[PDB]
Design a protein around this ligand. Structure first.
Ligand SMILES: CCOCCc1cc(C(=O)O)c2c(C(CC)CC)nn(-c3ccc(F)cc3)c2n1
Lengths: 9, 251
């Protein structure tokens, strides 16, 4: 998910 | 540790949001968009075919995507947010970002319009209403919320803690560690209470006012998602950004 992608920056 | 929580959250707010209340009021005190003519003039400079309402829709949703990314980095800087399981972090952001977006959006709004394009444009409230439905039905409840929210005369230090309390909400559907997130909110809320006591000694009832604002925002977002689905299903050219459709999905 993109939100996961944002939170794993 | 709670002794530095208020300063830490305020610093993270100043660090991560391109626009805040101090910056907005300076500007509001910018190309004015008030008709189809000035909209086209503004777009000639601030934008690198589709119907005018679909163009504003895209500029609006592109703004939200940027705010969602800023809110994501803000939440990362809230002490204890990163310690939560990653699925809990997604849930808090999923349900929290649009409550925070409409709360912070008040900072760039007055009774006549709102700042757009990173402070470079100002679109009038009447022009948005003059649009065709359902696009003219979107911003009216946000201006009304912003008008009563702005009357509380919060500053960026108040708003930073308010947004932190919005994100760290233990009530969201599907949360795993409810008891710990609730304790995180209790600390943020307690620091907010203390801050409102010092920063707004003239209104010893400001904190219950803000509690109601959090409830008002949850209703403002649920009604807003209904409009998102109206546009997703009945507007072909109004494509949804993948990140936003992820957020609005099952919410
Ligand atoms: C400051 C920039 O953001 C403003 C605030 C804003 C936010 C959203 C949002 O849900 O992300 C949004 C939308 C969504 C569909 C309902 C896009 C997913 N549509 N509109 C909107 C469109 C046309 C208008 F004429 C006025 C508002 C919006 N506006």
């Amino acid at each position: 998910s993109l939100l996961k992608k944002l939170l794993l920056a | 540790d709670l002794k530095s929580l208020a300063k830490r959250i305020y610093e993270a707010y100043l660090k991560n949001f391109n626009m805040n209340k101090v910056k907005a009021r300076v500007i509001l005190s910018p190309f004015v968009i008030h008709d189809m003519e000035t909209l086209c003039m503004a777009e000639k400079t601030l934008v690198a075919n589709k119907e005018a309402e679909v163009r504003i829709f895209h500029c609006c949703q592109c703004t939200s995507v940027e705010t969602v990314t800023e809110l994501t980095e803000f939440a990362k800087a809230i002490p204890g947010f990163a310690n939560l399981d990653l699925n809990d972090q997604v849930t808090l952001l999923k349900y929290g970002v649009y409550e925070a977006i409409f709360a912070m959006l008040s900072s760039v709004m007055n009774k006549d319009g709102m700042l757009v394009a990173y402070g470079n444009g100002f679109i009038t409230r009447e022009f948005l209403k003059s649009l065709r439905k359902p696009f003219c039905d979107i911003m009216e409840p946000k201006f009304d919320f912003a008008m009563k929210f702005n009357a509380l005369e919060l500053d960026d230090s108040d708003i930073s803690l308010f947004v932190a309390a919005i994100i760290c909400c233990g009530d969201r559907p599907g949360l795993l560690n409810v008891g710990h997130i609730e304790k995180m909110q209790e600390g943020i809320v307690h620091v907010l209470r203390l801050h409102l006591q010092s920063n707004h000694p003239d209104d010893i009832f400001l904190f219950p006012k803000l509690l109601q604002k959090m409830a008002d925002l949850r209703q403002l977002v649920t009604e807003h998602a209904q409009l998102v689905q109206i546009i997703k299903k009945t507007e072909s050219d109004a494509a949804l950004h993948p990140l936003l459709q992820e957020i609005y999905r099952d919410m």
